[PDB]
Subunit: 208 residues, 3 copies
Amino acid sequence: SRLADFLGFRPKTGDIDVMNRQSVGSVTISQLAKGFYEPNIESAINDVHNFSIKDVGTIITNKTGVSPEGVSQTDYWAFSGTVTDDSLPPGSPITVLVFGLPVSATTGMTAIEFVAKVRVALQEAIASFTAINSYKDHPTDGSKLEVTYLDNQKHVLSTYSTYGITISQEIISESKPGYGTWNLLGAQTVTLDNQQTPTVFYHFERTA
Amino acid sequence: SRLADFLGFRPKTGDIDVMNRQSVGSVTISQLAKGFYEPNIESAINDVHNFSIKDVGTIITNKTGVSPEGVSQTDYWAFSGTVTDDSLPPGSPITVLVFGLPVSATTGMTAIEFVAKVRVALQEAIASFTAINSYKDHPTDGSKLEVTYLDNQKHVLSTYSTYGITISQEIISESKPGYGTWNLLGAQTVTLDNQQTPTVFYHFERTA
Amino acid sequence: SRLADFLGFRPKTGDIDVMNRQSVGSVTISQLAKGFYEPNIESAINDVHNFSIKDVGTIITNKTGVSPEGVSQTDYWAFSGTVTDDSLPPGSPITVLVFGLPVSATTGMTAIEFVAKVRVALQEAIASFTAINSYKDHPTDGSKLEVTYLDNQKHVLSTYSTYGITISQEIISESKPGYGTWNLLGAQTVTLDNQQTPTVFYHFERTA
């Protein structure tokens, strides 16, 4: 169990949206088993989660032909400076945190050299399925890396400096809401009632 | 960041609803960059938010003809009494909190006079886009004000007295679930497969 | 009040999904009235809740014919051992917590005898609309009980032992996302644009 299970949540008065009988956030057996008996955040989030995901086989219709599937954000991670820590002799091994990822560097490294070590940290995050989906080298800049996340949430990271290296984010493509896997079944032309102009609808089915 | 980024969330076992890869609440680069490495509430809420907003161009169909758009609650805030502060002399300036809004009042003011000060606090909340969308004077009662909120959540405010002034809430119009801007495309009369009577469906397209 | 009203939430940058005006989690009059002026968890969950529940009359379409309604999880509560407490005399009445439920027990009881006390626990929980929806006796094993929860969230309980008795969980039927009451209006066979094969769609209307 985590903090959320034990953080109180104030349910809406008269709310019975959960299985036609109780309010979002109502305590569940999961909390009772740990000795908590109040409506809580864990329960509330799980409830809304259950309201938003439609069953496989469900159909979503739109007039754009754009998939309902979510899209992950992709950025450029940029670096500048020289790894510095004057309290240590040149070439001393140190750990530098890059947006939370521990990077093994050495004092004296230029940004170009440092970036090579960031590649290794990204590989490790990817391998443990932690936040990072994939990365690629920048085609014309050795001090930048392209990174794509696992989730499709929006991330705006603050620029900062650590051990002489300035780290910043440059958003390349925005994320897009959505979930699951959807298949374009096709199009259906329909002339709405009492109208003469036809409208083309595109139907998507959730396959996974 | 305040706290949500640093509050643990227990993910659902077997959950891969986020981009067909991970559970709602899985740690993201935003938390890593702040020094938090576990599944959390900030991320969980952002994930469900991503599941609940359909893309512009999406079609919603119903049989009522009622728009999917949300509606904010509207109240009457009522006041009565005289601003009092036995600890201070008549006419002494004081700050009174009206449902959290700071009102500049003076001991000795009548409820009607106080309401005039409340109008100023509402204007300031409106100008800073803080919870209040708009307000209007009660047509025939100088001790009441009509107020509409920015969000479309339900709000039940408790009656209370502060510095001699009793403040209460009278809900005029209920809020309604929903989001975005939707446009009625028209109607579609359809006779389901083995049926005798036609069914009229209304289609709404999200435009913003 | 509850803690959620006072825990900060970091809004999504550029987010105006709430009434086309503000971000999910923006402060509302409910928090202001309690002295909290920042974006928060309570508001955030309430906003997403407002996005995910579609109005009565809304139509959901799928190709499986499976109801969009949610389904609660159902388990088997297993018990083993003998009610013990060497610090007290035999038959001494004690309070045993079963997944948070307080059962009136007495040292010396066998697993079967204990279950009888558990039935009364589930009864008071059910009558109190607390987490438990219903319950029945195991088809065969008298040391087990079938239970169904009010919510449709997934629950994984850890096996534990207290007062000599070992309590365990066995998930029988998995829960399913969903909400409200939906009515299958019927089927609609349509041949999508330029297709030689017809597809059958099932339309469900939210009645409650």
